């Protein structure tokens, strides 16, 4: 019944957004909640954000 | 009847058929988004009876 | 209400420098230093490559015959090319090269306003005697982070199937730390200094940066100064 | 490199002593950069008779 078939291959690049699952090797799950500016990130005396 | 892969698709603009080649299949490297036409396909249905 | 003014701006590396603000009253070193880091880390003018059109390359997922870098990877290398312009808000730099060896950032086409702050920066390698790469690197200027994703809404037929967009990473500032040490002017009760130690890709002069940063502060306060 | 100024500023008076000013549209993270920088000069350094 099939005369011909066309397979298109799409390469999507998804980055990261609230709702994605993240976990360490230790059984700690998480859902990235907010994506915060570098300005508002807790920093040490040297000025390097976290 | 048989369904055609032809690039002539009812009720779509030139903007719709742009990303398709003469044969009706999207070009390699063409960036696409949701709703964009990958393969033009048309199937026979006769006497619509409107 | 003695107002501050700058003092020795000590360049250390082409990367970072320490600007200082001498006559600061009590606590104003923190009130500013923090307020200045905010506009410094975030809103500053910067120019990062955006659109890269390469030779025979249809999309970022291929491999150019003759270079050990995947196209996706060469684009990422372009995002880290630090440049500066003067009278153009976009200039298109032309890169051509061939022969076995590295293609650095010094192999581009010089323009009146083009200054490559890191000419050794590796764009990609070349693995075959005759293998040649031509690329149109369209560099524009802006502020903040403009991702490749939001760029394809204006579009309006960016048909050039060959033209690759990358994410605009535009910004000179990297890491800002501010430290307030007590400054003793020959006669005064107690004043503080402000050491703003910054780190940069070299596309902004320290004083200029610290000025346009501080410019916006008062420019936003404008409405604030009434109702 | 054109920046963004606020608009609308409904000032809701509460009594006569205190009030809630409101400032709509500021760019990213500037709510703190302004709000915190003014809080500082309001609580500490001000003209006063005590």
Swiss-Prot record, chain A:
The RNAP catalytic core consists of 2 alpha, 1 beta, 1 beta' and 1 omega subunit. When a sigma factor is associated with the core the holoenzyme is formed, which can initiate transcription. The rRNA transcription and antitermination complex (rrnTAC) consists of RNAP, NusA, NusB, NusE (rpsJ), NusG, SubB, ribosomal protein S4, DNA and precursor rRNA; S4 is more flexible than other subunits. In pull-down experiments interacts with CedA. Acetylated on several lysine residues in the presence of glucose. DNA-dependent RNA polymerase (RNAP) catalyzes the transcription of DNA into RNA using the four ribonucleoside triphosphates as substrates. This is DNA-directed RNA polymerase subunit beta. Belongs to the RNA polymerase beta chain family. The gene is rpoB. Transmembrane segments: none annotated. Co-administration of salinamide and rifampicin or salinamide and myxopyronin suppresses the emergence of resistance to both antibiotics.
From Swiss-Prot, chain C:
One of its GO terms (molecular function) is DNA binding. GO terms for biological process: bacterial-type flagellum assembly; bacterial-type flagellum-dependent cell motility; cell motility; cellular response to cell envelope stress; DNA-templated transcription initiation; intracellular iron ion homeostasis; nitrate assimilation; regulation of DNA-templated transcription elongation. Residues 155-158 are annotated as: Required for interaction with Crp at class II promoters. (Microbial infection) ADP-ribosylated on both alpha subunits by the phage T4 protein ModA. ADP-ribosylated on only one of the alpha subunits by the phage T4 protein Alt. Changing residue 38 to C: In rpoA112; temperature-sensitive, blocks RNA polymerase assembly. It comes from the Bacteria. Signal peptide: none annotated. Keywords: Acetylation, ADP-ribosylation, DNA-directed RNA polymerase, Nucleotidyltransferase, Transcription, Transferase. It catalyses: RNA(n) + a ribonucleoside 5'-triphosphate = RNA(n+1) + diphosphate. Residues 1-227 are annotated as: Alpha N-terminal domain (alpha-NTD). Its EC number is 2.7.7.6. It is an enzyme of class 2 (transferase). One of its GO terms (cellular component) is cytosol. Belongs to the RNA polymerase alpha chain family. DNA-dependent RNA polymerase (RNAP) catalyzes the transcription of DNA into RNA using the four ribonucleoside triphosphates as substrates. This subunit plays an important role in subunit assembly since its dimerization is the first step in the sequential assembly of subunits to form the holoenzyme. Homodimer. The RNAP catalytic core consists of 2 alpha, 1 beta, 1 beta' and 1 omega subunit. When a sigma factor is associated with the core the holoenzyme is formed, which can initiate transcription. Both the N- and C-terminus interact with different regions of transcriptional regulator CRP. The rRNA transcription and antitermination complex (rrnTAC) consists of RNAP, NusA, NusB, NusE (rpsJ), NusG, SubB, ribosomal protein S4, DNA and precursor rRNA; S4 is more flexible than other subunits. The N-terminal domain is essential for RNAP assembly and basal transcription, whereas the C-terminal domain is involved in interaction with transcriptional regulators (such as CRP) and with upstream promoter elements. This is DNA-directed RNA polymerase subunit alpha. It comes from Escherichia coli (strain K12). The chain holds residues 8 to 234 of 329 of the full protein.
């Amino acid at each position: 019944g099939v005369l011909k078939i066309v397979k298109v291959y799409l390469a999507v690049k998804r980055r990261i957004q609230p709702g994605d699952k993240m976990a360490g090797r230790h059984g700690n799950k998480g859902v990235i909640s907010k994506i915060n500016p570098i300005e508002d990130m807790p920093y040490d005396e040297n000025g390097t954000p976290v | 009847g048989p369904e055609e892969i032809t690039a002539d698709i009812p009720n779509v603009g030139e903007a719709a058929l742009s990303k398709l080649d003469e044969s009706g299949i999207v070009y390699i490297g063409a960036e696409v988004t949701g709703g964009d036409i990958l393969v033009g396909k048309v199937t026979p249905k006769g006497e619509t009876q409107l | 209400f003695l107002k501050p003014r700058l003092v020795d701006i000590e360049q250390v590396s082409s990367t970072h420098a320490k600007v200082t603000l001498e006559p600061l009253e009590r606590g104003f070193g923190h009130t500013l230093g923090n307020a200045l880091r905010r506009i410094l880390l975030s809103s500053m003018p910067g120019c990062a490559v955006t659109e890269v059109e390469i030779d025979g390359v249809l999309h970022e997922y291929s491999t150019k015959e003759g270079v050990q870098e995947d196209i996706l990877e060469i684009l990422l290398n372009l995002k880290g090319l630090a440049v500066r312009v003067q009278g153009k808000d976009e200039v298109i730099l032309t890169l051509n090269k061939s022969g076995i060896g590295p293609v650095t950032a010094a192999d581009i086409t010089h323009d009146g306003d083009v200054e490559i702050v890191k000419p050794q920066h590796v764009i990609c390698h070349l693995t075959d005697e005759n293998a040649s790469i031509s690329m149109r690197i369209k560099v524009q200027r802006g502020r903040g982070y403009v991702p490749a994703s939001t760029r394809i809404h204006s579009e309006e037929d960016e048909r050039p199937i060959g033209r690759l967009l990358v994410d605009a990473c535009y910004s000179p500032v990297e890491r800002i730390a501010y430290n307030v040490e007590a400054a003793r002017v020959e006669q005064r009760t107690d004043l503080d200094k402000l050491v703003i130690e910054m780190e940069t890709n070299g596309t902004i002069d320290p004083e200029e940066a610290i000025r346009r940063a501080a410019t916006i502060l008062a420019e936003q306060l404008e409405a604030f100064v009434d109702l | 490199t054109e920046f963004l100024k606020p608009r609308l500023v409904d000032i809701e008076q509460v009594s006569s002593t205190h009030a809630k000013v409101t400032l709509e549209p500021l760019e990213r993270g500037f709510g703190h950069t302004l709000g915190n920088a003014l809080r500082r000069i309001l609580l500490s350094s001000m003209p006063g008779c005590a």
